[PDB]
Amino acid sequence: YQEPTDPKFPQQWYLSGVTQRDLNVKAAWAQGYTGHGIVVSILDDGIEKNHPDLAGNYDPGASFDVNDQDPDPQPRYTQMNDNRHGTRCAGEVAAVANNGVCGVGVAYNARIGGVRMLDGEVTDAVEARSLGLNPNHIHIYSASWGPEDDGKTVDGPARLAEEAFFRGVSQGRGGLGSIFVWASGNGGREHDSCNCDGYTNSIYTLSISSATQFGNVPWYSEACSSTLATTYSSGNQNEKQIVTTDLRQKCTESHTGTSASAPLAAGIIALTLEANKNLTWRDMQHLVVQTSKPAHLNANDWATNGVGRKVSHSYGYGLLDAGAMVALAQNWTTVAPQRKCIIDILTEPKDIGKRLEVRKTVTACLGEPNHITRLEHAQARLTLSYNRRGDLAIHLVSPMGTRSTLLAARPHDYSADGFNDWAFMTTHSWDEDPSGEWVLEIENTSEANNYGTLTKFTLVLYGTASGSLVPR
Ligand SMILES: *[C@@H]1O[C@H](CO)[C@@H](O)[C@H](O)[C@H]1NC(C)=O
Ligand SMILES: [Ca+2]
Ligand SMILES: [Ca+2]
Ligand SMILES: [Ca+2]
Ligand SMILES: [Cl-]
Ligand code: NA
Ligand code: NA
Ligand code: NA
Numbered sequence: 010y011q012e013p014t015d016p017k018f019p020q021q022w023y024l025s026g027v028t029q030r031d032l033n034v035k036a037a038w039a040q041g042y043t044g045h046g047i048v049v050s051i052l053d054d055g056i057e058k059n060h061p062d063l064a065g066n067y068d069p070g071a072s073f074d075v076n077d078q079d080p081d082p083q084p085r086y087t088q089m090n091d092n093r094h095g096t097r098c099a100g101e102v103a104a105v106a107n108n109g110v111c112g113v114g115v116a117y118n119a120r121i122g123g124v125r126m127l128d129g130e131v132t133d134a135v136e137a138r139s140l141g142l143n144p145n146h147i148h149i150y151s152a153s154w155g156p157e158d159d160g161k162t163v164d165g166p167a168r169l170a171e172e173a174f175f176r177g178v179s180q181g182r183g184g185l186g187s188i189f190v191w192a193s194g195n196g197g198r199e200h201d202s203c204n205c206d207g208y209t210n211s212i213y214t215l216s217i218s219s220a221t222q223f224g225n226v227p228w229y230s231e232a233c234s235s236t237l238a239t240t241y242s243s244g245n246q247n248e249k250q251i252v253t254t255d256l257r258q259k260c261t262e263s264h265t266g267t268s269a270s271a272p273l274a275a276g277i278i279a280l281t282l283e284a285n286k287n288l289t290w291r292d293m294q295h296l297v298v299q300t301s302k303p304a305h306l307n308a309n310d311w312a313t314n315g316v317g318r319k320v321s322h323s324y325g326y327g328l329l330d331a332g333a334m335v336a337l338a339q340n341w342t343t344v345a346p347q348r349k350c351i352i353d354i355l356t357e358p359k360d361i362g363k364r365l366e367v368r369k370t371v372t373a374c375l376g377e378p379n380h381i382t383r384l385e386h387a388q389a390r391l392t393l394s395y396n397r398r399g400d401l402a403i404h405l406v407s408p409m410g411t412r413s414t415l416l417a418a419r420p421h422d423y424s425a426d427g428f429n430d431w432a433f434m435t436t437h438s439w440d441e442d443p444s445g446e447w448v449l450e451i452e453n454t455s456e457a458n459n460y461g462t463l464t465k466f467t468l469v470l471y472g473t474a475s476g477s478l479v480p481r
C-alpha cells in the first residue's frame with residue numbers, strides 16, 4: 010500500500026499520524042477500503058462541485074439545492090466567504106487523493122455531494138426534503154448543525170423531518186436504512202447540553218463529538234448521553250486543526266469545531282460500508298460501540314457500564330477506529346429486528362421541588378414480542394413543568410448501575426416552558442440487560458426555591474433478545 014502523495018496529507022495529522030493519536034485510517038486503506046461505491050451527502054450551505062479536489066468524486070445524484078429549489082448545490086459566493094462550510098466538510102469525507110492538490114478525504118474514492126439547505130430559511134419542509142434526498146442512492150448523510158447552540162434552546166425535528174428520519178432508516182438504502190451522521194454541537198462555551206438538540210439526541214442519528222490533538226475536551230464540546238463516539242478536531246492555538254478543501258478552489262488548515270468531526274466520522278462509516286454493504290443503520294451503531302477507543306482521551310467522567318465498556322458524556326465510547334471498524338464489519342452478523350418496550354412509569358404526578366427520585370423495577374416486556382434482554386438506545390420521555398428549566402439536572406440509572414446524565418444544568422436556560430414529552434436518550438447502557446430497577450433523578454442545582462411537577466415519565470427501551478457478547 011502506498012500512502013497518499015498529496016501536498017497537505019502530512020498536515021492531516023488525524024489521518025497521517027505515526028504517534029497513535031489518529032483515526033487509524035491508513036490501516037483501513039491498506040486493507041483495500043477507500044470508499045469505492047459509497048455515496049455521501051453533506052447537508053450544509055452548498056458544495057463547490059468544481060473544486061479541483063472534489064470534482065473527480067462529485068456526484069450530482071447526491072446533491073440538491075433546497076434553498077433555491079434546483080439540482081445545483083453550488084454555494085453563494087460572498088465577500089465574507091460565508092457559504093464555505095459544506096465544501097470544507099465534503100473534502101473531509103472525499104477529497105481526491107494522489108492528485109497534487111490539498112490533502113485527501115477519509116474515503117477518497119467515495120462519491121460526494123451536498124444539499125444546499127442552510128443558506129435560507131430552514132423550515133421543517135426544507136429539513137425533510139434534505140434528509141430524504143435520493144434515499145436509494147445516497148448511503149450516508151452528514152449534518153454538522155442543528156438548533157441554535159446558545160445553551161437555552163430545546164428543539165428538534167418537527168413532523169416532516171421526523172417522518173424523514175423514520176422513512177430513511179426504514180425504507181432507505183434498500184431497506185437497510187439511511188445512515189445519518191450528526192455533530193453533537195458547538196455550544197460548550199454556553200454550557201449547552203446536547204440532549205436538548207433533538208437531531209443529535211435521536212436514535213436515528215449516529216452522533217459524534219470532538220477531541221483536541223492533545224486528547225482533551227475542546228472548549229466548544231457539549232456533553233450528553235446521546236453521543237456515540239468521537240473524532241479529532243480543533244482545540245487551542247498550539248493544537249492543529251482540520252485540513253481540507255475550501256471555497257474558491259483553495260485549501261484550508263483551519264477547519265474547526267464539532268461540525269468538522271461529523272464529516273470525518275461519515276468518511277469512516279463510508280469505509281466501513283464498503284467493507285460490508287449489507288450493514289443496517291443499527292449494525293453501524295453497534296460497530297461504533299464495539300470498536301471505538303477511549304485510550305488517551307482525557308475526561309473526568311469515564312465510567313465503566315454494565316458490559317464493561319468505558320463511556321463518557323464528552324466522547325461516547327471513544328475515538329473512532331477505522332481499521333477496527335472495517336475489520337469487524339466484514340463478517341458482521343446482522344442484528345435481530347429492533348424491539349421497542351414502552352413502560353409508563355408514574356402512577357401519579359410528582360412534585361419536583363428541590364429534588365425528586367423515581368424508582369421503578371421493570372421486566373422489559375417479559376413474555377412479549379418486544380421483550381428486550383439486550384439494550385440499544387434507552388429514552389426517558391419526560392413531561393414536566395418547572396419555573397427555570399436550566400436549573401434542572403436529570404440523571405437516569407440503569408439496573409446495571411450505569412448513571413446517564415440526561416440533562417446537565419444550563420445556566421442560560423431561563424425558560425419556564427419545561428419539557429413536553431422530551432425523549433432524553435442515552436447510549437451508555439448499550440448491550441445491558443434492562444430488566445430490574447431504573448432510577449430517575451431530577452435535581453434543582455440552584456439555591457433558588459424553584460418549583461414544578463413531573464407529570465409523565467415513559468421509559469422506552471430499544472433492543473433485541475439475542476446475540477450478546479461476553480462483557481469486555
Ligand atoms: C443481508 O442481510 C440479510 C439479513 O441477515 C440477509 O437475509 C441477506 O441475505 C443479506 N444479503 C447479502 C447480499 O449478504
Ligand atoms: Ca442552485
Ligand atoms: Ca487531493
Ligand atoms: Ca447544542
Ligand atoms: Cl419508534
Ligand atoms: Na449544533
Ligand atoms: Na443520535
Ligand atoms: Na459501572
Ligand code: NA
Nearest residue numbers: 408443444445
Ligand atoms: Na436486571
